[PDB]
Amino acid sequence: GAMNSSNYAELFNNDIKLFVDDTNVYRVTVHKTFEGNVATKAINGCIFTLNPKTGHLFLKIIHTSVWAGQKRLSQLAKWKTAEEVSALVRSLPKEEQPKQIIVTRKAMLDPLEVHMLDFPNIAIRPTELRLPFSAAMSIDKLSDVVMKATEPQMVLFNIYDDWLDRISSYTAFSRLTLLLRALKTNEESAKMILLSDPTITIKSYHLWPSFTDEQWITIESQMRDLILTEYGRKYNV
Amino acid sequence: MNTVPFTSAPIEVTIGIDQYSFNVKENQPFHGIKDIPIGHVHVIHFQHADNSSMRYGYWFDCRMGNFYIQYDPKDGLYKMMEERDGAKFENIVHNFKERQMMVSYPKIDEDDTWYNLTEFVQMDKIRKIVRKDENQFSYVDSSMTTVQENELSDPAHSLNYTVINFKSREAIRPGHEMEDFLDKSYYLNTVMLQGIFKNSSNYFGELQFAFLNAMFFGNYGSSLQWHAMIELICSSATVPKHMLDKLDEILYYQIKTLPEQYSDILLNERVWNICLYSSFQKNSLHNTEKIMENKYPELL
Ligand SMILES: c1ccc(OCCNCc2ccco2)nc1
């Protein structure tokens, strides 16, 4: 059934599961044409497929060539997503395949379920959580590899860096969702928070800065402030 | 014009014969139904006055044998039986007709309703949906479940309708996922019509039988089957033109005949709005769309 706050620790048990977010698959810029009409120009996108327990991110880059000559692109994008999750699961060894796939948008249910009819023991589930995975393209290294791609490509990341050496997957996921919620509510401020101090760097093999435990508490507090504020500035409170 | 005699009417019952119905009182001198039109299947059905629970009845074709009804006080229902002695039967019916103890099948000459509801329904196909091979007639009641209902519990008492499931490996070919799910023409024309039903007449016959079991017995699995067989056609971009035209006629007479006070339970809002206003065939069911809009505008 649907995934919500009542069953949130299920994300961190030992049944393999993946979140799939399709919000960055089909991306466009809207512009005026010479005749004064409006047109879209597609830009590269990505499927965000994440194991919340391990931090493993399977980032399938969606090159704009996949839309050439196609109609109804917003609908095709959901089916393309489903077909991409389907090949990924099929390439994994049986003991690595997920027991559940959780889609962040309900319109992905039928495409993914039709694509995995020959995988009946994998549960396809919605969620009631409003997860901020759309903000993945505000992570500089992820955005860079998507925009530079000249062909379809899968890139593998650990979105938790090395955090699991010191914290649990519950805490890592909570940190991730806080960082992404911040980046989604006010990207400039969030990014200022994360890099204000030049002495803290991002390792070449990491996505986020190398904060100590104490610095993460500071950072996490600053992100909460950002989010509560913006929510004032937004709602005037 | 054939006859279905009754041994007696020991319990008070509302009796249906096709789209007609009449009340019989407890121990009233009632000995059956005469002037039944030859050439069509028929259904004779029952609702006891003391227990409206379980409508039940029998599909039959008078060309296939001499059938009568007899109440069974042990099992508590009116049972259809076949009389194999032709001379005994003729003699029984002649006596009951002479004493005017039979209701006349009350068909108006202008009226093609029953033909229109049963055009493609054949007894031989009914007997493959309702398996009881020792009888020439078929029992159906309100509670009977379908084979597909049982996959989601006595198999001998099931309705073996053709299983339709839009999210299944039969309905979807590997590599044609989005195509086959959004346009069901493959599933309609190749899997079902060419492969399973053989022709559209048999498909329409099962569709019509499903509707009639839904209407006459409140059989929920039959209603599900009727709507699925409609949705499968409406959700196909490629349908033979003669099939669309005939479907419109079939559904028109089903909607015309449906009791107005049963529309809430016998019509699925989602299926009908999708079929009439969103589907590939949204512009192909003129007669059906017009009667639906004038009779059940609330559903839509
Ligand atoms: C990309 C790679 C392989 C592949 O295999 C076909 C499995 N698709 C599921 C399904 C529906 C009906 C039957 O099987 N599909 C897409």
Residue B172 CB less than 6 A away from ligand 1 = yes
Provide the experimental method for this PDB entry.
X-ray
User: Nearest Cβ partner of B172 from A76, A79, A117?
Assistant: A117
Same domain, A102 and A187: no
CB contacts, 8 Å: A115 with chain B? 177
Q: Are A101 and A85 in contact (CB under 8 A)?
A: yes
Same domain, B56 and B136: yes
Same domain, B104 and B185: no
3-class state of residue B17 by DSSP? strand
Residue A236: C-alpha distances to residues A48, A224, A226, A228 (Å):
33, 17, 14, 11
**What does the longest C-alpha to C-alpha distance in chain A come to?**
59
Secondary structure letter of residue B188 according to DSSP: I
DSSP for A72-123, written as a single string: -HHHHHHHHHHHHHHHHHHHS-GGGS-SEEEESSGGGHHHHHHHTTT-TTSE
Same domain, A142 and A175: no
Q: Determine contact: A66 vs chain B, CB below 8 A.
A: no
Which of B116, B143, B170 delimits the end of a domain?
A: B143
Residue A22 tokens read as 């399709």
**A90 CA from centroid of ligand 1 (Å):** 9
- Please classify residue A5 by burial: count the beta carbons closer than 10 Å to its beta carbon, then call 0-12 exposed, 13-18 middle and 19+ buried: exposed
What's the rounded Cα separation, in Å, for the pair A56 and A49?
8
What's the rounded Cα separation, in Å, for the pair B151 and B157?
14
Q: Are B251 and B288 in contact (CB under 8 A)?
A: yes
DSSP for B237-264, written as a single string: S---HHHHHHHHHHHHHHHHHS-GGGHH
What's the rounded Cα separation, in Å, for the pair B288 and B251?
6
Q: Are A58 and A72 in contact (CB under 8 A)?
A: no
Return the half-sphere exposure (C-beta side, CA atoms, 13 A cut-off) of residue B263. 17
What's the rounded Cα separation, in Å, for the pair A151 and A148?
9
- How many separate domains does chain A show? 2
Same domain, B165 and B100: no
**A81 CA from centroid of ligand 1 (Å):** 13
Residue A112: C-alpha distances to residues A6, A19, B186, B236 (Å):
24, 12, 20, 21
* CB-CB neighbours of B97 under 10 Å: 16
**B174 CA from centroid of ligand 1 (Å):** 4
* CB-CB neighbours of B190 under 10 Å: 12
In chain B, which residue's Cα lies nearest the Cα of A110?
Answer: B167
Which residue out of B165, B172, B178, B186 would a mutagenesis test of the A interface target, given it has the greatest number of A Cβ atoms within 10 Å?
A: B178
**A69 CA from centroid of ligand 1 (Å):** 23
Q: Are A108 and A157 in contact (CB under 8 A)?
A: no
Secondary structure letter of residue A26 according to DSSP: S
* CB-CB neighbours of A199 under 10 Å: 5
The pick from B166, B172, B181, B187 for probing ligand 1's pocket by mutation, whose C-beta has the most ligand atoms within 8 angstroms, reads B172
What's the rounded Cα separation, in Å, for the pair A21 and A105?
7
A110 and B167: CB-CB below 8 Å?
A: yes
Q: Are A183 and A219 in contact (CB under 8 A)?
A: no
| Neighbouring-strand partners of residue B140 | B57
Secondary structure letter of residue A162 according to DSSP: T
Same domain, A139 and A211: no
Q: Are A82 and B177 in contact (CB under 8 A)?
A: yes
Closest CA to B43 of B71, B18, B9, B66: B18
| CA-nearest residue, atom 7 of ligand 1 | B174
What's the rounded Cα separation, in Å, for the pair B9 and B7?
7
Q: What is the domain extent for residue A112?
A: 9-163
How many residues in total does chain A contain?
A: 237
Three-state SS string over B139-177 comes to EEECCCCEHHHHCCCCHHHCECCCCCCCCCCCCCCCCCH
Phi-psi group of B175: left, alpha or beta (phi > 0 → left; psi -120 to 50 → alpha; rest → beta): left
What's the rounded Cα separation, in Å, for the pair B96 and B79?
19
What's the rounded Cα separation, in Å, for the pair B101 and B95?
9
Resolution in A: 1.6
Q: What is the domain extent for residue B163?
A: 144-300
Q: Are B113 and B20 in contact (CB under 8 A)?
A: no
What's the rounded Cα separation, in Å, for the pair A179 and A224?
9
CB contacts, 8 Å: B167 with chain A? 110, 113-114, 117
Same domain, A147 and A170: no
